[PDB]
Design a protein around this motif. Structure first.
Motif, mmCIF file in Angstrom:
data_model
loop_
_atom_site.group_PDB
_atom_site.id
_atom_site.type_symbol
_atom_site.label_atom_id
_atom_site.label_comp_id
_atom_site.label_asym_id
_atom_site.label_seq_id
_atom_site.Cartn_x
_atom_site.Cartn_y
_atom_site.Cartn_z
ATOM 1 N N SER A 123 10.163 -13.043 3.506
ATOM 2 C CA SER A 123 8.921 -12.595 2.866
ATOM 3 C C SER A 123 9.171 -11.250 2.217
ATOM 4 O O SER A 123 10.009 -10.518 2.682
ATOM 5 C CB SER A 123 7.763 -12.528 3.905
ATOM 6 N N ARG A 124 8.464 -10.913 1.140
ATOM 7 C CA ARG A 124 8.630 -9.574 0.539
ATOM 8 C C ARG A 124 8.417 -8.459 1.540
ATOM 9 O O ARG A 124 7.516 -8.524 2.372
ATOM 10 C CB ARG A 124 7.728 -9.386 -0.678
ATOM 11 N N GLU A 167 5.504 -18.080 2.269
ATOM 12 C CA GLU A 167 5.544 -16.660 2.481
ATOM 13 C C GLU A 167 4.681 -16.246 3.660
ATOM 14 O O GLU A 167 3.732 -16.902 3.955
ATOM 15 C CB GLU A 167 5.046 -15.978 1.247
ATOM 16 N N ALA A 169 4.173 -12.398 4.188
ATOM 17 C CA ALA A 169 4.181 -10.909 4.171
ATOM 18 C C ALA A 169 3.084 -10.362 5.037
ATOM 19 O O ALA A 169 1.984 -10.932 5.110
ATOM 20 C CB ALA A 169 3.961 -10.389 2.746
HETATM 21 NA NA NA Z 1 6.273 -12.584 0.061
#
Ligand code: NA
Length: 361
Positions: A123-124, A167, A169
């Protein structure tokens, strides 16, 4: 099976402003890499470890480095970058499937630091103050110091039965990291020393049910005016009170992959590629748009008051936010789109699977 390209009467005319290659991208591997934008520079990466700063206006290289490691005689081994990219304050951040997080300097693209996190970083990374937060695939939240990359704290959200696509984040609000995950929980942790504020079970543990091949749920929470919105891994939208984490409501849709909020609306894309708008307070559907069914949508984004999505055939579609009707269409790349469109400061970026970054109209 896949829906035919809808016929549209373009309300306006979309084109590629520019486009710059980025190695061989992600091809058909599972990745969450997408472009970032800060100070009129565009950052982008690929699976193998290539990263480029770009001039936002024409997409010519400002810099270009590889993070690929040593192999045998002649190849490099892929760095396997997966989460990113994220840029804040002259560091470019990227996570990898080898459980590394990189910080590159914006100026030259050199390693400011590189740290070994507690599991894969798909994930970012997310920046709060002087803290880079990393939600790992094995249920840990870690705060790294922005300056040197030392691990300031680690919190255990509890190890997921399986990891799933999507994802996850963290997001931040009023000094708390709010994080979902594959475990069926959402948790709020205070960002000072990682103290647990609340934890709320929003579904049962994975799984607990069969995992369907079209599931790809993005469990990143979104906090808007005292409410936490979060997809559980089964595809259900849930709303929680930000203060206590207590469940307000649950839309047993069972099919949602991505959503965004804006104003008094939630826009989302379900697993079948049905698109849909809902009311923010109650999550009641206002309209539905199924013409893209089974083309393969990215997550959606808002740019110039329209909803934009990419499909895996290489088209972008613009959708009218008030009634869900097609406002414009475009063939853009032929490798297809997979990861998310990005909208910041009057730029509309998207990276196709072959790695190519586009800037639109
Ligand atoms: Na992300």
């Amino acid at each position: 099976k896949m829906s035919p390209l809808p016929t549209v009467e373009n309300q306006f005319t979309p084109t590629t402003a520019w486009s710059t290659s980025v190695g061989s991208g992600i091809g058909n591997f599972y990745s969450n890499l997408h472009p970032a934008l800060a100070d009129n520079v565009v950052y982008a990466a690929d699976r193998a470890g290539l990263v480029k700063a770009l001039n936002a206006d024409d997409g010519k290289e400002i810099w270009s480095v590889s993070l690929a490691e040593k192999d045998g005689w002649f190849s490099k081994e892929p760095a396997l970058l997966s989460g990113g990219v994220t840029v804040s304050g002259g560091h470019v951040y990227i996570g990898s499937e080898k459980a590394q997080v990189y910080a590159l300097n914006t100026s030259d693209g050199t390693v400011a630091w590189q740290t070994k996190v507690a599991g894969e970083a798909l994930s970012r990374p997310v920046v709060s103050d002087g803290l880079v937060l990393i939600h790992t695939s094995n249920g840990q939240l870690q705060a790294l110091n922005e300056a040197d990359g030392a691990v300031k704290w680690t919190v255990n959200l509890d190890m997921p039965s399986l990891s799933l696509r999507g994802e996850s984040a963290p997001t931040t609000a009023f000094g708390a990291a709010v994080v979902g995950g594959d475990n069926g929980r959402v948790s709020a942790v205070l960002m000072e020393q990682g103290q647990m504020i609340w934890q709320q079970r929003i579904s049962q543990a994975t799984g607990s049910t069969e995992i369907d091949r079209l599931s790809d749920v993005d469990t990143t929470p979104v906090v808007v005016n005292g409410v936490v919105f979060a997809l559980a891994y089964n595809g259900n939208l849930t709303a929680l009170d930000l203060r206590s984490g207590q469940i307000m409501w649950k839309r047993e849709l069972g099919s949602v992959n991505d959503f965004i909020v804006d104003g008094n609306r939630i826009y989302l894309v379900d697993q079948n590629d049905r698109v849909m708008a809902l009311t923010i307070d109650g999550g009641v559907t206002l309209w539905t748009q199924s013409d893209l069914l089974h083309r393969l949508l990215t997550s959606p984004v808002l740019y110039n008051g329209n909803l934009v999505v990419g499909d895996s055939e290489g088209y972008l579609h613009w959708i009218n936010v008030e009634d869900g009707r097609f406002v414009a269409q475009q063939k853009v790349d032929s490798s297809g789109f997979q990861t998310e469109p990005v909208a910041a400061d009057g730029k509309l970026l998207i990276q196709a699977k072959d790695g190519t970054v586009y800037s639109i109209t």
